[PDB]
Design a protein around this ligand. Structure first.
Ligand SMILES: Nc1ncnc2c1ncn2[C@@H]1O[C@H](COP(=O)(O)OP(=O)(O)CP(=O)(O)O)[C@@H](O)[C@H]1O
Ligand SMILES: [Mg+2]
Ligand SMILES: [Mg+2]
Length: 426
Protein backbone atom coordinates (compact mmCIF):
# COMPACT_ATOMS: atom_id res chain seq x y z
CA UNK A 1 0.00 0.00 0.00
CA UNK A 2 1.10 3.58 -0.55
CA UNK A 3 -0.13 4.75 2.80
CA UNK A 4 -2.04 2.81 5.44
CA UNK A 5 -5.74 3.37 5.74
CA UNK A 6 -8.25 3.58 8.49
CA UNK A 7 -11.65 1.92 8.62
CA UNK A 8 -13.59 5.13 9.29
CA UNK A 9 -12.05 6.85 6.24
CA UNK A 10 -13.50 4.07 4.01
CA UNK A 11 -17.19 3.73 4.91
CA UNK A 12 -17.87 6.42 2.29
CA UNK A 13 -15.42 5.15 -0.41
CA UNK A 14 -16.50 1.52 0.14
CA UNK A 15 -20.24 1.98 0.76
CA UNK A 16 -19.83 0.26 4.17
CA UNK A 17 -20.53 0.33 7.97
CA UNK A 18 -17.88 0.24 10.72
CA UNK A 19 -18.78 -2.09 13.63
CA UNK A 20 -16.54 -1.76 16.69
CA UNK A 21 -13.40 0.33 17.19
CA UNK A 22 -11.63 2.19 14.39
CA UNK A 23 -8.20 0.91 13.27
CA UNK A 24 -5.37 1.41 10.75
CA UNK A 25 -3.91 -1.23 8.47
CA UNK A 26 -0.95 -1.21 6.06
CA UNK A 27 -1.63 -4.49 4.20
CA UNK A 28 -4.45 -6.98 3.49
CA UNK A 29 -4.78 -10.80 3.52
CA UNK A 30 -7.63 -13.00 2.18
CA UNK A 31 -6.09 -16.06 3.83
CA UNK A 32 -6.09 -16.94 7.51
CA UNK A 33 -2.98 -19.19 7.37
CA UNK A 34 -0.81 -16.16 6.21
CA UNK A 35 -1.76 -12.97 8.09
CA UNK A 36 -0.25 -10.81 10.80
CA UNK A 37 -0.09 -7.47 12.69
CA UNK A 38 -1.13 -4.21 11.01
CA UNK A 39 -3.23 -6.07 8.47
CA UNK A 40 -6.80 -6.31 7.22
CA UNK A 41 -8.54 -9.59 6.72
CA UNK A 42 -10.89 -9.93 3.80
CA UNK A 43 -13.47 -12.61 4.50
CA UNK A 44 -14.33 -14.22 1.14
CA UNK A 45 -16.32 -17.41 0.65
CA UNK A 46 -15.49 -19.45 3.99
CA UNK A 47 -13.32 -16.70 5.56
CA UNK A 48 -16.13 -15.74 7.98
CA UNK A 49 -15.55 -18.89 10.10
CA UNK A 50 -11.97 -17.95 10.83
CA UNK A 51 -12.46 -14.64 12.69
CA UNK A 52 -10.84 -15.90 15.96
CA UNK A 53 -7.85 -17.34 13.99
CA UNK A 54 -7.03 -13.97 12.27
CA UNK A 55 -7.65 -11.96 15.47
CA UNK A 56 -5.38 -14.22 17.50
CA UNK A 57 -2.81 -13.64 14.72
CA UNK A 58 -2.92 -9.78 14.95
CA UNK A 59 -5.14 -8.60 12.12
CA UNK A 60 -6.48 -5.21 13.14
CA UNK A 61 -9.91 -5.81 11.49
CA UNK A 62 -12.06 -7.84 9.06
CA UNK A 63 -13.88 -6.87 5.83
CA UNK A 64 -17.10 -8.85 5.77
CA UNK A 65 -20.22 -9.22 3.65
CA UNK A 66 -22.29 -10.52 6.61
CA UNK A 67 -22.04 -9.56 10.29
CA UNK A 68 -17.39 -11.12 17.19
CA UNK A 69 -13.70 -10.85 18.14
CA UNK A 70 -12.57 -7.91 15.96
CA UNK A 71 -13.79 -4.72 14.28
CA UNK A 72 -15.89 -5.34 11.19
CA UNK A 73 -16.16 -3.12 8.18
CA UNK A 74 -19.38 -4.49 6.66
CA UNK A 75 -20.01 -4.37 2.90
CA UNK A 76 -22.52 -5.91 0.47
CA UNK A 77 -19.72 -7.69 -1.65
CA UNK A 78 -16.15 -8.48 -0.43
CA UNK A 79 -14.81 -9.34 -3.91
CA UNK A 80 -16.14 -5.92 -4.95
CA UNK A 81 -14.72 -4.19 -1.83
CA UNK A 82 -11.32 -5.69 -2.57
CA UNK A 83 -11.59 -4.31 -6.11
CA UNK A 84 -12.24 -0.87 -4.77
CA UNK A 85 -9.20 -0.94 -2.45
CA UNK A 86 -7.03 -1.96 -5.34
CA UNK A 87 -8.18 0.79 -7.66
CA UNK A 88 -7.95 3.15 -4.74
CA UNK A 89 -4.37 2.28 -3.94
CA UNK A 90 -3.59 2.27 -7.68
CA UNK A 91 -4.71 5.89 -7.83
CA UNK A 92 -2.02 6.99 -5.36
CA UNK A 93 0.73 5.41 -7.46
CA UNK A 94 1.95 8.13 -9.85
CA UNK A 95 4.52 6.03 -11.74
CA UNK A 96 4.37 4.33 -15.20
CA UNK A 97 2.33 1.11 -15.45
CA UNK A 98 1.92 -1.55 -18.10
CA UNK A 99 -0.52 -4.42 -18.34
CA UNK A 100 -1.10 -7.32 -20.68
CA UNK A 101 -3.46 -10.03 -21.74
CA UNK A 102 -3.94 -12.71 -24.36
CA UNK A 103 -4.53 -16.45 -24.64
CA UNK A 104 -0.86 -17.28 -24.11
CA UNK A 105 2.43 -15.59 -23.29
CA UNK A 106 1.16 -12.95 -20.93
CA UNK A 107 3.42 -14.20 -18.04
CA UNK A 108 6.47 -14.42 -20.26
CA UNK A 109 5.87 -10.93 -21.59
CA UNK A 110 5.38 -9.83 -17.97
CA UNK A 111 8.72 -11.36 -17.08
CA UNK A 112 10.53 -9.93 -20.05
CA UNK A 113 9.06 -6.52 -19.32
CA UNK A 114 9.92 -6.55 -15.58
CA UNK A 115 13.37 -7.74 -16.50
CA UNK A 116 13.82 -4.83 -18.96
CA UNK A 117 12.65 -2.35 -16.36
CA UNK A 118 14.63 -3.84 -13.54
CA UNK A 119 17.83 -3.97 -15.60
CA UNK A 120 17.23 -0.37 -16.62
CA UNK A 121 16.51 0.81 -13.07
CA UNK A 122 18.64 -1.23 -12.46
CA UNK A 123 17.01 -2.36 -9.23
CA UNK A 124 14.67 -5.30 -8.82
CA UNK A 125 12.92 -3.82 -5.79
CA UNK A 126 11.71 -0.76 -7.69
CA UNK A 127 9.61 -2.53 -10.37
CA UNK A 128 6.44 -4.32 -9.01
CA UNK A 129 5.09 -7.22 -11.13
CA UNK A 130 2.19 -9.60 -10.56
CA UNK A 131 3.47 -12.40 -8.27
CA UNK A 132 2.66 -15.67 -10.01
CA UNK A 133 -0.73 -15.87 -11.70
CA UNK A 134 -2.66 -13.40 -9.54
CA UNK A 135 -4.21 -12.01 -12.69
CA UNK A 136 -7.96 -12.59 -12.18
CA UNK A 137 -10.73 -10.72 -10.30
CA UNK A 138 -9.16 -11.24 -6.83
CA UNK A 139 -5.58 -11.53 -8.09
CA UNK A 140 -5.37 -8.09 -9.68
CA UNK A 141 -6.61 -5.95 -6.75
CA UNK A 142 -4.41 -8.03 -4.40
CA UNK A 143 -1.47 -7.27 -6.73
CA UNK A 144 -2.53 -3.57 -6.86
CA UNK A 145 -2.41 -3.32 -3.06
CA UNK A 146 1.23 -4.47 -3.29
CA UNK A 147 1.96 -1.08 -4.86
CA UNK A 148 4.01 0.91 -2.39
CA UNK A 149 6.32 3.86 -2.02
CA UNK A 150 9.54 2.15 -3.14
CA UNK A 151 8.12 1.16 -6.53
CA UNK A 152 8.59 3.51 -9.49
CA UNK A 153 7.01 1.32 -12.16
CA UNK A 154 4.66 -1.70 -12.39
CA UNK A 155 3.71 -4.60 -14.68
CA UNK A 156 0.27 -6.17 -14.39
CA UNK A 157 -0.97 -9.49 -15.81
CA UNK A 158 -4.67 -9.62 -16.70
CA UNK A 159 -6.29 -13.00 -17.40
CA UNK A 160 -9.94 -13.86 -18.17
CA UNK A 161 -11.98 -16.98 -17.54
CA UNK A 162 -14.92 -14.98 -19.11
CA UNK A 163 -16.41 -11.87 -20.71
CA UNK A 164 -16.26 -8.63 -18.65
CA UNK A 165 -13.53 -9.86 -16.26
CA UNK A 166 -10.79 -7.84 -18.01
CA UNK A 167 -12.99 -4.73 -18.40
CA UNK A 168 -13.62 -4.92 -14.63
CA UNK A 169 -10.01 -5.33 -13.71
CA UNK A 170 -8.67 -2.92 -16.30
CA UNK A 171 -10.82 -0.20 -14.72
CA UNK A 172 -9.07 -0.98 -11.44
CA UNK A 173 -5.69 -0.96 -13.13
CA UNK A 174 -6.08 1.92 -15.63
CA UNK A 175 -2.68 1.37 -17.38
CA UNK A 176 -0.52 3.70 -19.53
CA UNK A 177 0.38 0.72 -21.79
CA UNK A 178 -1.81 -2.27 -22.72
CA UNK A 179 -0.64 -5.42 -24.50
CA UNK A 180 -2.45 -8.16 -26.38
CA UNK A 181 -0.17 -11.12 -27.08
CA UNK A 182 -2.72 -13.11 -29.08
CA UNK A 183 -6.35 -14.38 -28.99
CA UNK A 184 -16.75 -19.25 -28.29
CA UNK A 185 -13.84 -17.99 -30.47
CA UNK A 186 -15.46 -14.53 -30.86
CA UNK A 187 -16.07 -14.26 -27.09
CA UNK A 188 -12.28 -14.80 -26.53
CA UNK A 189 -11.46 -11.89 -28.95
CA UNK A 190 -14.06 -9.58 -27.39
CA UNK A 191 -12.72 -10.45 -23.98
CA UNK A 192 -9.07 -9.62 -24.72
CA UNK A 193 -9.76 -6.22 -26.33
CA UNK A 194 -11.66 -5.27 -23.15
CA UNK A 195 -8.16 -4.20 -22.07
CA UNK A 196 -8.29 -1.32 -24.54
CA UNK A 197 -11.22 0.11 -22.44
CA UNK A 198 -8.79 0.94 -19.53
CA UNK A 199 -6.28 2.95 -21.64
CA UNK A 200 -6.27 6.84 -21.65
CA UNK A 201 -6.87 8.66 -25.03
CA UNK A 202 -3.11 8.97 -25.52
CA UNK A 203 -2.20 5.63 -23.80
CA UNK A 204 -0.38 3.26 -26.14
CA UNK A 205 -1.65 -0.12 -27.26
CA UNK A 206 0.53 -3.01 -28.28
CA UNK A 207 -0.90 -5.43 -30.77
CA UNK A 208 0.10 -8.54 -32.70
CA UNK A 209 -0.31 -7.68 -36.40
CA UNK A 210 -0.17 -11.41 -37.24
CA UNK A 211 -3.30 -12.22 -35.21
CA UNK A 212 -6.58 -12.66 -37.08
CA UNK A 213 -8.21 -10.41 -34.48
CA UNK A 214 -5.87 -7.57 -35.36
CA UNK A 215 -8.58 -5.51 -36.97
CA UNK A 216 -11.29 -5.85 -34.25
CA UNK A 217 -8.72 -4.47 -31.90
CA UNK A 218 -7.39 -1.75 -34.17
CA UNK A 219 -10.99 -0.57 -34.25
CA UNK A 220 -11.57 -0.77 -30.50
CA UNK A 221 -8.43 1.25 -29.78
CA UNK A 222 -10.05 4.34 -31.40
CA UNK A 223 -7.06 6.45 -32.51
CA UNK A 224 -4.85 5.73 -29.48
CA UNK A 225 -1.13 5.53 -30.11
CA UNK A 226 -0.39 2.06 -31.48
CA UNK A 227 2.74 -0.10 -31.57
CA UNK A 228 2.67 -3.41 -33.57
CA UNK A 229 4.67 -6.65 -33.56
CA UNK A 230 5.05 -9.33 -36.28
CA UNK A 231 7.41 -12.18 -37.25
CA UNK A 232 6.26 -11.95 -40.88
CA UNK A 233 5.50 -8.39 -41.91
CA UNK A 234 8.01 -5.67 -42.87
CA UNK A 235 5.67 -2.76 -42.00
CA UNK A 236 5.30 -3.47 -38.24
CA UNK A 237 6.85 -1.18 -35.68
CA UNK A 238 8.76 -4.12 -34.08
CA UNK A 239 10.25 -7.00 -36.06
CA UNK A 240 12.61 -9.95 -35.89
CA UNK A 241 14.89 -11.34 -38.62
CA UNK A 242 17.45 -14.18 -38.80
CA UNK A 243 15.87 -16.46 -36.22
CA UNK A 244 18.48 -19.13 -35.45
CA UNK A 245 18.75 -21.55 -32.51
CA UNK A 246 21.97 -21.65 -30.46
CA UNK A 247 23.47 -25.01 -29.56
CA UNK A 248 21.33 -25.46 -26.43
CA UNK A 249 18.36 -24.66 -28.67
CA UNK A 250 17.43 -21.21 -27.33
CA UNK A 251 16.15 -18.72 -29.90
CA UNK A 252 18.39 -16.03 -31.38
CA UNK A 253 17.14 -13.16 -33.64
CA UNK A 254 18.08 -9.67 -34.99
CA UNK A 255 15.56 -7.19 -33.54
CA UNK A 256 14.41 -4.40 -35.87
CA UNK A 257 12.00 -1.49 -36.28
CA UNK A 258 11.45 1.79 -34.53
CA UNK A 259 13.67 1.20 -31.47
CA UNK A 260 16.79 0.37 -33.51
CA UNK A 261 18.51 -2.79 -34.83
CA UNK A 262 20.32 -5.23 -32.52
CA UNK A 263 21.10 -8.92 -31.89
CA UNK A 264 19.27 -10.73 -29.14
CA UNK A 265 19.97 -14.20 -27.88
CA UNK A 266 17.21 -15.29 -25.47
CA UNK A 267 17.63 -18.12 -22.88
CA UNK A 268 14.30 -19.63 -23.91
CA UNK A 269 12.81 -22.04 -26.52
CA UNK A 270 10.32 -21.65 -29.40
CA UNK A 271 9.51 -19.18 -32.19
CA UNK A 272 6.59 -17.97 -29.98
CA UNK A 273 8.92 -16.37 -27.43
CA UNK A 274 10.36 -14.17 -30.16
CA UNK A 275 6.87 -12.74 -30.57
CA UNK A 276 6.69 -12.34 -26.76
CA UNK A 277 10.00 -10.50 -26.81
CA UNK A 278 8.84 -8.13 -29.54
CA UNK A 279 5.84 -7.29 -27.41
CA UNK A 280 7.92 -6.67 -24.27
CA UNK A 281 10.23 -4.48 -26.41
CA UNK A 282 7.40 -2.44 -27.91
CA UNK A 283 6.08 -1.77 -24.38
CA UNK A 284 9.49 -0.87 -23.09
CA UNK A 285 9.94 1.48 -26.05
CA UNK A 286 6.59 3.10 -25.19
CA UNK A 287 7.97 3.67 -21.67
CA UNK A 288 11.02 5.28 -23.26
CA UNK A 289 13.63 2.61 -22.39
CA UNK A 290 16.65 2.89 -24.73
CA UNK A 291 17.62 0.13 -27.20
CA UNK A 292 20.14 -1.62 -24.84
CA UNK A 293 17.99 -1.50 -21.68
CA UNK A 294 15.71 -3.69 -23.75
CA UNK A 295 18.41 -6.03 -25.10
CA UNK A 296 20.13 -6.35 -21.73
CA UNK A 297 16.80 -7.18 -20.03
CA UNK A 298 15.79 -9.78 -22.59
CA UNK A 299 19.21 -11.45 -22.49
CA UNK A 300 19.27 -11.33 -18.68
CA UNK A 301 16.08 -13.43 -18.41
CA UNK A 302 16.61 -17.02 -17.17
CA UNK A 303 13.67 -19.41 -17.16
CA UNK A 304 12.29 -20.62 -13.84
CA UNK A 305 14.29 -23.62 -12.58
CA UNK A 306 12.54 -26.81 -13.58
CA UNK A 307 10.47 -25.24 -16.40
CA UNK A 308 11.89 -25.75 -19.89
CA UNK A 309 15.55 -25.11 -18.93
CA UNK A 310 17.60 -26.02 -22.00
CA UNK A 311 21.26 -26.73 -21.33
CA UNK A 312 24.14 -28.62 -22.92
CA UNK A 313 26.19 -31.35 -21.34
CA UNK A 314 29.96 -31.57 -21.59
CA UNK A 315 29.36 -34.59 -23.84
CA UNK A 316 27.43 -32.49 -26.45
CA UNK A 317 24.02 -33.73 -25.41
CA UNK A 318 21.11 -31.24 -25.44
CA UNK A 319 19.03 -31.49 -22.29
CA UNK A 320 15.71 -29.87 -21.26
CA UNK A 321 14.98 -29.91 -17.52
CA UNK A 322 11.19 -29.54 -17.15
CA UNK A 323 10.57 -30.94 -13.61
CA UNK A 324 0.21 -33.26 -16.97
CA UNK A 325 -1.47 -31.36 -19.81
CA UNK A 326 2.02 -29.86 -20.10
CA UNK A 327 3.29 -33.36 -20.95
CA UNK A 328 1.67 -32.64 -24.33
CA UNK A 329 3.20 -29.14 -24.51
CA UNK A 330 6.59 -30.70 -23.72
CA UNK A 331 6.10 -33.30 -26.43
CA UNK A 332 5.47 -30.49 -28.92
CA UNK A 333 8.50 -28.54 -27.72
CA UNK A 334 10.63 -31.60 -28.44
CA UNK A 335 8.85 -32.23 -31.72
CA UNK A 336 10.40 -28.94 -32.95
CA UNK A 337 13.89 -30.52 -32.91
CA UNK A 338 15.87 -31.66 -35.91
CA UNK A 339 17.93 -34.67 -34.79
CA UNK A 340 16.99 -37.72 -32.84
CA UNK A 341 14.79 -36.67 -29.94
CA UNK A 342 13.94 -38.44 -26.71
CA UNK A 343 11.21 -38.04 -24.15
CA UNK A 344 11.89 -39.05 -20.57
CA UNK A 345 9.04 -39.29 -18.12
CA UNK A 346 8.46 -40.46 -14.61
CA UNK A 347 4.99 -41.01 -13.20
CA UNK A 348 2.24 -38.41 -12.83
CA UNK A 349 1.05 -39.38 -9.32
CA UNK A 350 -6.99 -42.60 -14.72
CA UNK A 351 -4.14 -44.99 -15.68
CA UNK A 352 -5.66 -44.22 -19.09
CA UNK A 353 -4.14 -40.74 -19.51
CA UNK A 354 -0.69 -42.37 -19.51
CA UNK A 355 -1.74 -44.50 -22.49
CA UNK A 356 -3.24 -41.39 -24.05
CA UNK A 357 0.05 -39.58 -23.73
CA UNK A 358 2.13 -42.48 -25.07
CA UNK A 359 0.11 -42.66 -28.29
CA UNK A 360 0.11 -38.88 -28.66
CA UNK A 361 3.88 -38.86 -28.50
CA UNK A 362 4.26 -41.48 -31.23
CA UNK A 363 4.96 -39.78 -34.58
CA UNK A 364 6.43 -36.62 -33.04
CA UNK A 365 9.56 -37.91 -31.05
CA UNK A 366 12.20 -40.53 -31.91
CA UNK A 367 11.84 -42.31 -28.58
CA UNK A 368 10.28 -42.46 -25.15
CA UNK A 369 12.12 -43.85 -22.13
CA UNK A 370 10.16 -44.02 -18.90
CA UNK A 371 10.08 -45.00 -15.26
CA UNK A 372 7.46 -45.97 -12.68
CA UNK A 373 4.34 -48.18 -12.78
CA UNK A 374 1.80 -46.04 -14.71
CA UNK A 375 4.36 -45.23 -17.47
CA UNK A 376 4.58 -48.90 -18.60
CA UNK A 377 1.31 -48.22 -20.33
CA UNK A 378 2.68 -45.19 -22.19
CA UNK A 379 5.74 -47.06 -23.54
CA UNK A 380 3.43 -49.78 -24.88
CA UNK A 381 1.04 -47.28 -26.42
CA UNK A 382 3.91 -45.48 -28.19
CA UNK A 383 5.13 -48.77 -29.67
CA UNK A 384 8.37 -50.20 -31.00
CA UNK A 385 11.00 -47.55 -30.22
CA UNK A 386 9.84 -47.18 -26.55
CA UNK A 387 11.95 -48.59 -23.69
CA UNK A 388 10.40 -48.92 -20.23
CA UNK A 389 12.60 -48.96 -17.12
CA UNK A 390 12.74 -50.47 -13.64
CA UNK A 391 14.64 -47.63 -11.90
CA UNK A 392 16.42 -44.30 -12.49
CA UNK A 393 19.79 -46.09 -12.73
CA UNK A 394 19.21 -48.29 -15.78
CA UNK A 395 17.53 -45.25 -17.35
CA UNK A 396 20.55 -42.96 -16.79
CA UNK A 397 22.75 -45.78 -18.09
CA UNK A 398 20.71 -45.97 -21.29
CA UNK A 399 20.83 -42.16 -21.60
CA UNK A 400 24.59 -41.85 -21.19
CA UNK A 401 24.65 -43.75 -24.53
CA UNK A 402 23.07 -41.05 -26.67
CA UNK A 403 25.11 -39.30 -29.41
CA UNK A 404 25.17 -35.45 -29.81
CA UNK A 405 22.55 -33.66 -32.00
CA UNK A 406 20.16 -35.80 -29.97
CA UNK A 407 17.81 -33.76 -27.80
CA UNK A 408 16.51 -35.07 -24.49
CA UNK A 409 13.60 -33.94 -22.39
CA UNK A 410 12.88 -34.92 -18.83
CA UNK A 411 9.55 -34.52 -17.04
CA UNK A 412 7.51 -36.02 -14.16
CA UNK A 413 5.81 -35.04 -10.89
CA UNK A 414 7.83 -33.74 -7.90
CA UNK A 415 7.15 -37.01 -5.96
CA UNK A 416 8.49 -38.85 -9.04
CA UNK A 417 11.74 -36.85 -8.44
CA UNK A 418 13.19 -36.76 -11.96
CA UNK A 419 15.51 -33.82 -11.09
CA UNK A 420 17.65 -36.75 -9.92
CA UNK A 421 18.14 -37.57 -13.66
CA UNK A 422 18.96 -33.98 -14.83
CA UNK A 423 21.70 -33.86 -12.20
CA UNK A 424 23.03 -37.22 -13.41
CA UNK A 425 23.91 -35.71 -16.85
CA UNK A 426 24.53 -32.01 -16.04
N1 LIG B 1 2.81 -16.27 -28.07
C1 LIG B 1 2.41 -17.54 -27.81
N2 LIG B 1 1.68 -18.26 -28.71
C2 LIG B 1 1.30 -19.52 -28.43
N3 LIG B 1 1.61 -20.14 -27.26
C3 LIG B 1 2.34 -19.53 -26.30
C4 LIG B 1 2.79 -18.16 -26.53
N4 LIG B 1 3.48 -17.79 -25.43
C5 LIG B 1 3.47 -18.83 -24.56
N5 LIG B 1 2.78 -19.85 -25.09
C6 LIG B 1 2.55 -21.16 -24.45
O1 LIG B 1 1.83 -21.02 -23.21
C7 LIG B 1 2.61 -21.61 -22.17
C8 LIG B 1 2.70 -20.71 -20.95
O2 LIG B 1 3.08 -19.38 -21.31
P1 LIG B 1 2.57 -18.17 -20.35
O3 LIG B 1 2.53 -18.70 -18.93
O4 LIG B 1 3.26 -16.86 -20.69
O5 LIG B 1 1.08 -18.12 -20.90
P2 LIG B 1 -0.04 -17.38 -20.06
O6 LIG B 1 0.57 -16.68 -18.74
O7 LIG B 1 -0.63 -16.40 -20.99
C9 LIG B 1 -1.24 -18.67 -19.69
P3 LIG B 1 -2.06 -18.40 -18.11
O8 LIG B 1 -3.49 -17.69 -18.39
O9 LIG B 1 -2.24 -19.85 -17.47
O10 LIG B 1 -1.24 -17.59 -17.16
C10 LIG B 1 3.99 -21.97 -22.70
O11 LIG B 1 4.31 -23.34 -22.44
C11 LIG B 1 3.92 -21.76 -24.19
O12 LIG B 1 4.04 -22.98 -24.93
MG1 LIG C 1 0.24 -16.65 -16.42
MG1 LIG D 1 0.92 -18.64 -17.44
Amino acid sequence: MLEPLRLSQLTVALDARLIGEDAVFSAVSTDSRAIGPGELFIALSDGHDYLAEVAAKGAVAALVEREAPLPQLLVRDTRAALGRLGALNRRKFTGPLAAMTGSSGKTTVKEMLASILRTQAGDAESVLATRGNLNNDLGVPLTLLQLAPQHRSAVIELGASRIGEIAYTVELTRPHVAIITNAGPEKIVEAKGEILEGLAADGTAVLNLDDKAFDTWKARASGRPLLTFSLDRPQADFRAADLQRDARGCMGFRLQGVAGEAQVQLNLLGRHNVANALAAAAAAHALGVPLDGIVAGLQALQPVKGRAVAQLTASGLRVIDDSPASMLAAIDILSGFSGRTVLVLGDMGAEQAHREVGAYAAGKVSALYAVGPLMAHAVQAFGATGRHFADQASLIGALATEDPTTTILIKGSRSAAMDKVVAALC
